[PDB]
mmCIF file of C-alpha atoms in Angstrom:
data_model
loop_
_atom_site.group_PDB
_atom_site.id
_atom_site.type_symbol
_atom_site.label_atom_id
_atom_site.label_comp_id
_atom_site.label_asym_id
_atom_site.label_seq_id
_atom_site.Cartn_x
_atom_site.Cartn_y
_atom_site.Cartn_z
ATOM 1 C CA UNK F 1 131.444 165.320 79.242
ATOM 2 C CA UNK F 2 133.670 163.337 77.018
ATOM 3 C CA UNK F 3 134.574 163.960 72.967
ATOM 4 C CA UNK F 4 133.884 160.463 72.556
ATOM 5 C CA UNK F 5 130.544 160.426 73.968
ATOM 6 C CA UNK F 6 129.546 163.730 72.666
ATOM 7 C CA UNK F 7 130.614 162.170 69.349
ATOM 8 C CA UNK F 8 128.302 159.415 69.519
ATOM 9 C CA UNK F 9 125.294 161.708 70.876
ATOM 10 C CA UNK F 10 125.495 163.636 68.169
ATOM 11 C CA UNK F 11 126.018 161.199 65.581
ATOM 12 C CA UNK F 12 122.793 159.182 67.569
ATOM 13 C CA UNK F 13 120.841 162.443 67.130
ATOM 14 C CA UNK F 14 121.246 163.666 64.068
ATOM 15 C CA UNK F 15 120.223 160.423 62.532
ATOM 16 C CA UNK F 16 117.406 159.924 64.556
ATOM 17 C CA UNK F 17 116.428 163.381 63.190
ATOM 18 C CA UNK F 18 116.444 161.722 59.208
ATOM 19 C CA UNK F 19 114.930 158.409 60.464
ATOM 20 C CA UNK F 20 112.116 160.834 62.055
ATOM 21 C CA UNK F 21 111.388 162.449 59.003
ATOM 22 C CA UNK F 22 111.158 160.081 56.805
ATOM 23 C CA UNK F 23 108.854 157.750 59.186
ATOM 24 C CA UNK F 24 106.426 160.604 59.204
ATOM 25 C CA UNK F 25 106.543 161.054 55.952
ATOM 26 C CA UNK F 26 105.668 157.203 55.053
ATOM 27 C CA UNK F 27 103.388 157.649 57.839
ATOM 28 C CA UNK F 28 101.332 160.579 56.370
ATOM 29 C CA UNK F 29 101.091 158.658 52.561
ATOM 30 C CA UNK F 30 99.769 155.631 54.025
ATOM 31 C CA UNK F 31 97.339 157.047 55.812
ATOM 32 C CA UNK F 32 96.617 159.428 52.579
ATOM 33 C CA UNK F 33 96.184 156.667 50.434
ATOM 34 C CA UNK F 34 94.678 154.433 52.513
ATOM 35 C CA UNK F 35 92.019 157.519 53.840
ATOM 36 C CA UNK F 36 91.614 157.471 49.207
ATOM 37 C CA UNK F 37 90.455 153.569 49.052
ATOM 38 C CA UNK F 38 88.218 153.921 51.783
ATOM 39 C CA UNK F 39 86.362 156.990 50.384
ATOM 40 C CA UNK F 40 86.168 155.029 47.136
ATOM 41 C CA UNK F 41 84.934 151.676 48.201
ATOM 42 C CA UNK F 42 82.411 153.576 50.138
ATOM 43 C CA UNK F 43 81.459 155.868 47.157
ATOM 44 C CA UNK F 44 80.981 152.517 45.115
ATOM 45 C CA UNK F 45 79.101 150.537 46.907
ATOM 46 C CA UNK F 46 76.872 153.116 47.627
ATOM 47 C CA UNK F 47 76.418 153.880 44.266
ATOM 48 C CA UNK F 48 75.947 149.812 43.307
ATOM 49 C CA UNK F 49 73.257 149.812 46.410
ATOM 50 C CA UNK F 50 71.704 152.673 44.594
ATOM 51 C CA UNK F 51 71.720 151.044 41.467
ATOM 52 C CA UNK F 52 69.784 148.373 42.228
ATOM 53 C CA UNK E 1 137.022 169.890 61.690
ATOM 54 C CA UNK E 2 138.910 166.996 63.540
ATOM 55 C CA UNK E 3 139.639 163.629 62.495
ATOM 56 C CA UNK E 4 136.562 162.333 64.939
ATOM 57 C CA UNK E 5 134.066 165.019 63.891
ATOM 58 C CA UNK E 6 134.920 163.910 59.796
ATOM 59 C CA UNK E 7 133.976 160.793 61.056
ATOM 60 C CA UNK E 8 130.786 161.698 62.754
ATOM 61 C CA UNK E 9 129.583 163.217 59.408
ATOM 62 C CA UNK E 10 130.990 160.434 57.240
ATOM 63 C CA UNK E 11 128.791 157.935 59.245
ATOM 64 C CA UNK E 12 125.713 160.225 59.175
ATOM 65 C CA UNK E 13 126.024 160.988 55.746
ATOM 66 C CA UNK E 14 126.498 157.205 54.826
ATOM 67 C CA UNK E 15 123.504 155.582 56.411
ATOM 68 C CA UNK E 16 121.537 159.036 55.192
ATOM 69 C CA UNK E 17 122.022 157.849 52.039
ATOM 70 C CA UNK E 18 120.787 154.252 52.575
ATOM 71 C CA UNK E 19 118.067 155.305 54.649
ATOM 72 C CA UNK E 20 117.020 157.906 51.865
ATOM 73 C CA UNK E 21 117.266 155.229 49.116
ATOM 74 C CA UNK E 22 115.323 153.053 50.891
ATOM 75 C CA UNK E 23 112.466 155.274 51.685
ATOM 76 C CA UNK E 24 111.933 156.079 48.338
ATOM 77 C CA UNK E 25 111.465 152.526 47.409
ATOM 78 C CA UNK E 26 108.853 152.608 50.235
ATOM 79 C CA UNK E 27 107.497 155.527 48.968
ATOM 80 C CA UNK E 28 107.030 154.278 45.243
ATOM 81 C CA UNK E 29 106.042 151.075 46.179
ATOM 82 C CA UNK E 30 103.034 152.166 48.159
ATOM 83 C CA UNK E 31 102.025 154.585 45.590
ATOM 84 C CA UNK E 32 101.962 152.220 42.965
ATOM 85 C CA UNK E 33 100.172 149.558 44.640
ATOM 86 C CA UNK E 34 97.865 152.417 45.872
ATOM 87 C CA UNK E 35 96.855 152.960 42.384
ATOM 88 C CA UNK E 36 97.027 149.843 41.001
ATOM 89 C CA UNK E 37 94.337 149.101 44.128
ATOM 90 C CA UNK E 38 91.973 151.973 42.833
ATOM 91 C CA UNK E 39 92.125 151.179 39.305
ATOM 92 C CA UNK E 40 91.146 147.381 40.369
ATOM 93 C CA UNK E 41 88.353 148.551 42.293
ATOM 94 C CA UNK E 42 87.011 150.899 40.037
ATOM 95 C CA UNK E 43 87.478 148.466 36.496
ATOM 96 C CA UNK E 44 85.456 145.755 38.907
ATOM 97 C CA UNK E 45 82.612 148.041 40.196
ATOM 98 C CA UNK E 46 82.190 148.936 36.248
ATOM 99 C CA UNK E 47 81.743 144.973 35.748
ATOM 100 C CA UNK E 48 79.038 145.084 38.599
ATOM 101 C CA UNK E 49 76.951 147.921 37.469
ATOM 102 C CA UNK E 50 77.090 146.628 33.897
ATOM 103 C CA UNK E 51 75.363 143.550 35.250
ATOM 104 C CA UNK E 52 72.610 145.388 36.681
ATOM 105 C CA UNK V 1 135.255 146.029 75.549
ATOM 106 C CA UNK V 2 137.748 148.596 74.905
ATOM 107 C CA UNK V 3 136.393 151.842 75.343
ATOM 108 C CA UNK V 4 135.934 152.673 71.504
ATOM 109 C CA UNK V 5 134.123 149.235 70.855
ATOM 110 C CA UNK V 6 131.991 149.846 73.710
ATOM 111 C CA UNK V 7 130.894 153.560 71.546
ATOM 112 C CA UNK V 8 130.103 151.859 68.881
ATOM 113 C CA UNK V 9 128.130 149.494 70.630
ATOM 114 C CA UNK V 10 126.463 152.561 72.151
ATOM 115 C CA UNK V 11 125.387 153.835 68.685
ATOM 116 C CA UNK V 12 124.100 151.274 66.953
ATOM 117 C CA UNK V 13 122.133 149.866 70.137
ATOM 118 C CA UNK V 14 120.548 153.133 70.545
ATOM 119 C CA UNK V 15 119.776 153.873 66.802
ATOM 120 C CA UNK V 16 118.850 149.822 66.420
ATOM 121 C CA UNK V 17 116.212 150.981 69.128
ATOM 122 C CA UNK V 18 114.791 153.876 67.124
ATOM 123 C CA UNK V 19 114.525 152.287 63.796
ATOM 124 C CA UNK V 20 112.907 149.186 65.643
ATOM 125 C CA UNK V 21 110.421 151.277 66.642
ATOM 126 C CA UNK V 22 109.715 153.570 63.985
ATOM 127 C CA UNK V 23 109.242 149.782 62.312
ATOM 128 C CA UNK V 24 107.019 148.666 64.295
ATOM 129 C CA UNK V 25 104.850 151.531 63.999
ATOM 130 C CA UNK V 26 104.573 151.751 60.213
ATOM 131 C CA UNK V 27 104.108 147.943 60.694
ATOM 132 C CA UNK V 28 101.087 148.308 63.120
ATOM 133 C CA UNK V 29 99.665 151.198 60.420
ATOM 134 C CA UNK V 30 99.569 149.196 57.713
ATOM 135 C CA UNK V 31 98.082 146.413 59.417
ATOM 136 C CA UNK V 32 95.381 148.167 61.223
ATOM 137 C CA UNK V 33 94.414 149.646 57.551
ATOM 138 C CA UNK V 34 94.976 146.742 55.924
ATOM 139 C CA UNK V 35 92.456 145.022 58.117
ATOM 140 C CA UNK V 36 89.805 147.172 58.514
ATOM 141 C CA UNK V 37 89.893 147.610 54.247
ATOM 142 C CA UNK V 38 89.292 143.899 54.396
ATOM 143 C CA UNK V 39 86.659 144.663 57.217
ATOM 144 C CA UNK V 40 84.671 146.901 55.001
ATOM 145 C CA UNK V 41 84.970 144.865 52.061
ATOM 146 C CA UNK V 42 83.265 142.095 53.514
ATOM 147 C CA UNK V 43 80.233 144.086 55.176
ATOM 148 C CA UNK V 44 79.598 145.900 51.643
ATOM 149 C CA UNK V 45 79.690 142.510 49.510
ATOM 150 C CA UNK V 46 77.392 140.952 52.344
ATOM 151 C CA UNK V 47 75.009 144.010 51.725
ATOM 152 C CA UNK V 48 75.546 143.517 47.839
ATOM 153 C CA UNK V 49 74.561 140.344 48.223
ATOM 154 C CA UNK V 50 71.564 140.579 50.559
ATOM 155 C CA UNK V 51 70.417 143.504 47.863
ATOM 156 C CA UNK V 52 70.351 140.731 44.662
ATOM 157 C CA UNK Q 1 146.250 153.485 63.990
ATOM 158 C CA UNK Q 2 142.846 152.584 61.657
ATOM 159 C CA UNK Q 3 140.589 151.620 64.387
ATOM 160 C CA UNK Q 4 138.453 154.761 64.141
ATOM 161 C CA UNK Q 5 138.082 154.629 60.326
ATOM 162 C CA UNK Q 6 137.648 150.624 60.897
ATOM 163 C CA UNK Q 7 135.189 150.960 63.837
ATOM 164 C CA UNK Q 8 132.982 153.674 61.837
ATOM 165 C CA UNK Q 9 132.828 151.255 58.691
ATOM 166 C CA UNK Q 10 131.810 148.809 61.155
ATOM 167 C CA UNK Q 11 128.869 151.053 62.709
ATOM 168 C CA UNK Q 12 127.686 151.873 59.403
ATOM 169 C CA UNK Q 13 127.959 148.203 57.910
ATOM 170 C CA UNK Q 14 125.920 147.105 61.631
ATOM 171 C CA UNK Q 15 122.940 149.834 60.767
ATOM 172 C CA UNK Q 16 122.984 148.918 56.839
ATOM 173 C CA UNK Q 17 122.006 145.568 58.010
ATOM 174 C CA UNK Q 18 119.577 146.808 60.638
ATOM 175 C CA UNK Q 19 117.626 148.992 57.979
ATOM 176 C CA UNK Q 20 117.957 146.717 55.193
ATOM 177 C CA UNK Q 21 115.707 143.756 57.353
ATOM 178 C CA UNK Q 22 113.216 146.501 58.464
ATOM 179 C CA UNK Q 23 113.107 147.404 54.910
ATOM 180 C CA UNK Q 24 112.536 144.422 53.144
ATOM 181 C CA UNK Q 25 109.678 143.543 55.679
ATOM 182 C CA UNK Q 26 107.767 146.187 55.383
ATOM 183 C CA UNK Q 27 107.815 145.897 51.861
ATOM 184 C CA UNK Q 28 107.034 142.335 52.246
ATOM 185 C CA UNK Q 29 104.318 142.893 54.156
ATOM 186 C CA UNK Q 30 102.875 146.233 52.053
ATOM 187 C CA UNK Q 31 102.685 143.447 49.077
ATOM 188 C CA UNK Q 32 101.544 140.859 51.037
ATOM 189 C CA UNK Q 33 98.454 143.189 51.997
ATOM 190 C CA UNK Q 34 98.140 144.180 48.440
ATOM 191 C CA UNK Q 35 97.977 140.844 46.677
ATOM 192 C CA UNK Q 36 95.548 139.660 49.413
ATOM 193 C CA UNK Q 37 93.101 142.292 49.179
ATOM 194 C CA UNK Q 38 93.231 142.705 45.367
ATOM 195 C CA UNK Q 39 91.927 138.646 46.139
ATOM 196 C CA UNK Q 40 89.293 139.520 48.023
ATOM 197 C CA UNK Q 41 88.199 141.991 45.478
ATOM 198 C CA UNK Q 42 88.499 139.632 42.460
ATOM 199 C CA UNK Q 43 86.678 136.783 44.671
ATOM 200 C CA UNK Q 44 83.809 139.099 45.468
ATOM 201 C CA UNK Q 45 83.414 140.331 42.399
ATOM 202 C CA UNK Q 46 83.113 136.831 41.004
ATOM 203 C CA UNK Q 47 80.500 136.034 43.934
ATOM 204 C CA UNK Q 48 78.266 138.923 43.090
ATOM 205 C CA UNK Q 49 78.160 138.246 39.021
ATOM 206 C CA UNK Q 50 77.286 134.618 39.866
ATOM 207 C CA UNK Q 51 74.008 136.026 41.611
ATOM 208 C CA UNK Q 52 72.997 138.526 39.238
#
């Protein structure tokens, strides 16, 4: 088993748990925002094409 | 509450708070350059459909 | 090493490995949206243009 | 003796490193995408008013 090893396990896994979180997070707003410019570009040209 | 299981949550707390500050810098920075992006797009489709 | 060097070893290889790779996923995301805005972009101002 | 206090300021100082690289490219590369395709935008744009 070993303290020390446990130790480092849990010190391995609990951070890997914040690091985790927070990648999804940026994750998730990237893909939000870049999901946003796409629907706008697309909304603007097509209006511009309309227009003539 | 040993002196090695203080230590585990010293080190996880530490780099938590690095890791935190560093995502929100992420965070703000692709927010802002997310809108700054739309408002660019938007002031220079104005400029097109003023043209004609 | 000595057996406490070799743990620490241990924990930053093995976190090292997650935040590489949480890294090079956000990296790849950005990218990949990156480059297909700049895909669309310069389809729609090849239509604008073909349009007058 | 210190070696366990030592050894987990050394972890922590190893990771800050580690995290503070990943961090600065990514937000290297976020502006990097930003500047280029606010380019594009501003080139196009100045394309398109030069043909009507």
């Amino acid at each position: 088993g070993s303290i020390i090893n446990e130790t480092a396990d849990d010190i391995v896994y609990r951070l890997t748990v914040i690091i985790d979180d927070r990648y999804e997070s940026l994750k998730n707003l990237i893909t939000l925002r870049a999901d946003r410019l796409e629907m706008i570009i697309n909304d603007n040209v097509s209006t511009i094409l309309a227009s003539i």
